[PDB]
Design a protein around this nucleic acid. Structure first.
Ligand code: ZN
Ligand code: ZN
Ligand code: ZN
Ligand code: ZN
Lengths: 463, 463
RNA sequence: AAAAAA
RNA sequence: AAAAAA
């Protein structure tokens, strides 16, 4: 009557953890990133960012005076009101680095959470400055510096680990949240760089170790997952910049370099080249003085003792007057204004509001890309037109990306071996590209590969 | 009553040379370049090239068997019949380098001119091979090897000087035709590279000397004059390739590199990297063997004694079978097929017509660009689809251009100080970009800056 | 941005 | 691909 069919060994389940991946902002767009990681009833927030272009489309703005609710209505700050309906209490806010798409919304949203703000030293300095620049939301959260390779136990069941990585700003980290059932890894704004000009090479060994210890979920940026191959190293930008600055038959012509003030590796390269060219490096711009000086006071960069740094309008105008009468061949001005921002040094120069006069053949080196949005594109077009009309020669895009490419994401999937993968930090189109890469690696959409929209919670019941 | 005055000039001399710039091919399109420089009745032809896409659009066509007139009707070679209306006798044919857009039409057009063919040693080797495979015209011009930095006296009034430059193939030169009234400089397919991995740095000193001695006219390529800034050095391609090949956590996976067979510097880099990776470099492909062997056999490269080189179908299939049974992680195959050419090694592999089987995770590195015309785009798309469907990971465009950018052209204008400038070697759109740069430098179109079409002769007289 | 092809 | 603004 009855035949035996077979046997199956049932596994043990010694620890049941309910994980929640909550997408607050930056899953439908570039900017205003915010993620919440729930471990049963505790919540770790990662990255309260701003979306700058939605600010730029309104002329009468002054983000500093606006309340967070209007900023949410504008879509510039993550709509974190969904947090009142996530089942848990926030125990920490973590920021992976100091870019505004990760810390820009801190002074508008952090004060409502009874939780510290945990970040790397440079990031904590930048967060403190960002909060100090507003006196409308009095945000006085405890601010904790956690260095890369260090751990901090936030709950008996939750620990936070920073992993060193590379990016277009120093002191970027992966975040690993360790839970009774494994690790949740957050990797947004990262880049593998085996030859960085500043810092150490990302911790591939620890990444393999984490992959072997158990990763429940990987939250990772999708920004350049559609660019084939691997990201070029910062060394490539360094060498291209060296060739533009030194490899020329027009040594004694005027030269200006503009780049991101927070791109400390790039700025460091530029000032060392200045020493090679026999020119004095002159950093111009409030943001230049702030960011480079902060880096210097934390021991992140070294600086030649002939460097000159001016952030004040009249010190800047005076330095430019001194440069003009001493000879532009005698200095290398590194200044703000690469996106044509009004009020930045290069834009005031282009408008003739300056003692510095651009002449035919003067070289202007944009060690940056143009941010692909119509607003910044219009500003850069106006600035470049003005500079070209005064005879300047433009060296654009002397630059490499700060984001992992498709094959970098492939390698990170192979190292971390996550049970689940969640693309973050982009549009649904960038997520599409990531999804096709992840399917190539074995993941399945809606099963182990998850497409989230702003305001959605993915629940993971890990045995 | 009314009165004024004027000084009449003397009709006396304080012996007249007429210069002619004749555009035959390559001024309306990419490919089939050919220029004629006339000094009163003597003519120096520069570059009889082929335009390959006009061949590719016709099904199953044997250019080697075709007459010159059918090829001209196809648009695939310069229409030199206009030479029967130019008042002079051709005294020399000069080729600036061995690319097919400069030498491909030689076995169809050179034999009708009572003149030698003058080129650099490597270029002469390639020309001799090109003639040997010709099967319709009996070509018996003498081929004279002239090294860079040497001069050769062609007529009582005309000498030819080669100046070394950098390009995507070794032994490229500028040509300076010295006449009684000054020099005519031809600079097509050149690139400034202060750190080349092969050859010497272009002779900037001689270029300045020429500019000060007197240059009547500069004929120059416009190919990338619309690219802002300066061309990245070949060292950049070298370092990107080094990082792709060496910078990975997947040491023991299969890797295949494809690149231009004539890019001897790139191939040299790849083989030295193979030595670093602990793999055996195996060059596969008829063109690979021909070009690399000619370079090695003339002392342009050195090669490790473990290198293997196979141009024959069965040596190739045997080497691939040996690679599969010895382990793909133990070899670095450098092969033809980067444009998806049918019959090339990579294409036959993708078609599964070889012992080599591509598996998931195998890396295919195109150290090349996709040539922007619909035919090669279709071929590369088919090849890439086939490779991706077999699990390959694609690293594309690990590559830098071999052509000067806008500011490189600016500095060459500043060095050579030509009286007249003539853009060549591109479409009228590329010439538009050049013209806009040259107007920035003081030239005026139709006066000292001249946009010529195929089949036009520009006259340059003495004041 | 000018091949591949034995 | 996330600013500037003494
Ligand atoms: Zn960032
Ligand atoms: Zn970001
Ligand atoms: Zn060429
Ligand atoms: Zn060419």
């Amino acid at each position: 009557h009855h035949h035996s069919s077979g046997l199956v060994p049932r596994g043990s389940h010694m620890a049941s953890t309910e994980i929640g991946i909550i997408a607050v902002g930056g899953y439908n767009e570039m900017g205003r990133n915010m993620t919440a990681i729930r471990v049963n009833e505790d919540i770790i927030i990662i990255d309260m960012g701003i979306r700058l272009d939605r600010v730029q489309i309104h002329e009468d703005v002054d983000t500093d005076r606006m309340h967070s609710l209007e900023l949410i209505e504008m879509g510039a700050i993550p709509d974190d009101t969904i947090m009142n309906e996530v089942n848990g209490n926030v125990r920490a806010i973590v920021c992976t680095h100091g870019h505004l798409d990760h810390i820009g919304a801190i002074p508008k949203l952090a004060h409502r959470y009874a939780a510290p703000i945990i970040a790397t030293p440079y990031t904590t300095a930048l967060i403190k400055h960002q909060i100090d620049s507003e006196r409308k939301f009095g945000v006085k959260n405890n601010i904790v510096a956690l260095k890369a390779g260090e751990t901090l136990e936030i709950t008996k069941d939750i620990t936070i680990e920073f992993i060193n990585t590379q990016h277009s700003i120093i002191d970027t980290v992966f975040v690993a949240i360790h839970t009774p059932s494994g690790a949740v890894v957050y990797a947004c704004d990262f880049k593998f760089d085996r030859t960085p000009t500043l810092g150490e090479v990302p911790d591939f060994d620890r990444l393999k170790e984490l992959g072997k210890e158990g990763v429940i979920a990987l939250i990772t940026e999708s920004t350049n997952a559609g660019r084939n191959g691997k990201t070029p190293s910062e060394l490539i930008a360094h060498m291209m910049l060296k060739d533009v600055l030194l490899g020329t038959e027009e040594s004694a012509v005027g030269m200006i370099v503009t780049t991101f003030a927070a791109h400390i590796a790039r700025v460091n390269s530029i000032v060392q080249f200045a020493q090679e060219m026999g020119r004095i490096p002159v950093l111009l711009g409030r943001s230049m003085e702030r960011y480079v000086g902060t880096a210097y006071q934390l021991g992140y960069i070294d600086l030649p003792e002939n460097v000159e740094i001016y952030g004040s309008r009249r010190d800047i105008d005076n330095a430019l007057k001194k440069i003009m009468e001493a000879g532009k061949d005698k200095y290398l001005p590194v200044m703000t204004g690469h996106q044509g921002e009004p009020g930045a040094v290069l834009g005031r120069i282009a408008n003739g509001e300056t003692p510095f006069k651009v002449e035919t053949g003067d070289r202007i080196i944009f060690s940056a890309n143009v941010i692909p949005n119509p607003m910044t594109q219009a500003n850069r077009y106006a600035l470049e037109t003005k500079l070209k009309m005064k005879g300047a020669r433009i060296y654009d895009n002397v630059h490499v990306s700060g984001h992992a490419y498709r094959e970098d994401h492939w390698e990170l999937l192979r190292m971390l071996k996550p049970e689940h993968v969640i693309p973050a930090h982009g549009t649904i189109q960038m997520h599409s590209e990531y999804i096709q890469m992840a399917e190539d690696a074995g993941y399945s959409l809606g099963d182990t590969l998850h497409l989230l929209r702003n305001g959605e919670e993915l629940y993971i019941e890990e045995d």
